[PDB]
């Protein structure tokens, strides 16, 4: 996935200033930029009007454990929030699932992040995808530089 | 719910499954737990509406908080990464770790089932089965939740 340097700067500046998880206090800007340039962190998704309700077009499903964070860069998504599944539209720079990253910790149970919402693609999507593991590694890397 | 069958399953759990061993749970309490309402359940099978959500006792990558012991009937089990399919019948049990798994250390998030402020928290300690269980016929089975199991332990602790 090839993106322009301008777009990379915009998403970098937004996360570093708006999302505390990526604040310079938690994560150095040098590491953050490397994390964004990491392969498959930035992804795209081709939309199919025929298969609109396909599983490949659901970034999040309510009551389905997930372990990654998303930042929409381009495109439209439908969001189903709450018990009644209140639908509304979200576009660029709407993010989801930060708690999957920043949540603090064989025969044990597992702490998971379960979204109280669903996110479905309405059109072609370009977005960021950062897993808890990628984020925790980014903290350790920035925790020593 | 014949007395003969109830004793058989009691002896099986108390001897085969350590979670219900006399060391963990007295045999007197175990019997009371089995006679507890809704611990023993049934399920009518519909050949027309097979693969229905009401016929899945367990679903892959779907958090669960209960234990099952088949008493009568057949189920299809899809186990592991490669989804090895096999058939299981009476006295096949599932989800023991759902009961005996210990919580995360120095963790404040609530466990699924206990409902300790779960209604508003998105972080939940869960047991996630690496398998699926689908009903192939009418089922009679035991169903013990983590909370019902923990309550049985406290009862036997006195």
Curated annotation (Swiss-Prot), chain A:
Locations listed in the record: Cell membrane
Tissue expression notes: Widely expressed. Expressed at higher level in brain, kidney and placenta, while it is weakly expressed in skeletal muscle. In the kidney, it is expressed in the distal convoluted tubule and the thick ascending limb of Henle loop.
Source species, domain of life: Eukaryota
Family from the record: Belongs to the ACDP family.
Annotated disease: Hypomagnesemia 6: A renal disease characterized by severely lowered serum magnesium levels in the absence of other electrolyte disturbances. Affected individuals show an inappropriately normal urinary magnesium excretion, demonstrating a defect in tubular reabsorption. Age of clinical onset is highly variable and some affected individuals are asymptomatic. Hypomagnesemia, seizures, and impaired intellectual development 1: A disease characterized by renal wasting of magnesium, low serum magnesium, seizures, and variable degrees of delayed psychomotor development.
Protein purpose: Divalent metal cation transporter. Mediates transport of divalent metal cations in an order of Mg(2+) > Co(2+) > Mn(2+) > Sr(2+) > Ba(2+) > Cu(2+) > Fe(2+).
Miscellaneous comment in the UniProt entry for this protein: Shares weak sequence similarity with the cyclin family, hence its name. However, it has no cyclin-like function in vivo.
Protein name: Metal transporter CNNM2
Source organism (scientific name): Homo sapiens (Human)
Lineage, opening ranks: Eukaryota, Metazoa, Chordata, Craniata, Vertebrata
Complete-protein stretch covered: 618 to 822 of 875
From Swiss-Prot, chain B:
Name assigned to this protein: Metal transporter CNNM2
Record function comment: Divalent metal cation transporter. Mediates transport of divalent metal cations in an order of Mg(2+) > Co(2+) > Mn(2+) > Sr(2+) > Ba(2+) > Cu(2+) > Fe(2+).
Organism, scientific name: Homo sapiens (Human)
Further details from the record: Shares weak sequence similarity with the cyclin family, hence its name. However, it has no cyclin-like function in vivo.
Location in or out of the cell: Cell membrane
Source organism, top-level taxon: Eukaryota
Tissue: Widely expressed. Expressed at higher level in brain, kidney and placenta, while it is weakly expressed in skeletal muscle. In the kidney, it is expressed in the distal convoluted tubule and the thick ascending limb of Henle loop.
Parent-protein start and end of this portion: 620 to 821 of 875
Gene it is expressed from: CNNM2
Family note: Belongs to the ACDP family.
Disease: Hypomagnesemia 6: A renal disease characterized by severely lowered serum magnesium levels in the absence of other electrolyte disturbances. Affected individuals show an inappropriately normal urinary magnesium excretion, demonstrating a defect in tubular reabsorption. Age of clinical onset is highly variable and some affected individuals are asymptomatic.
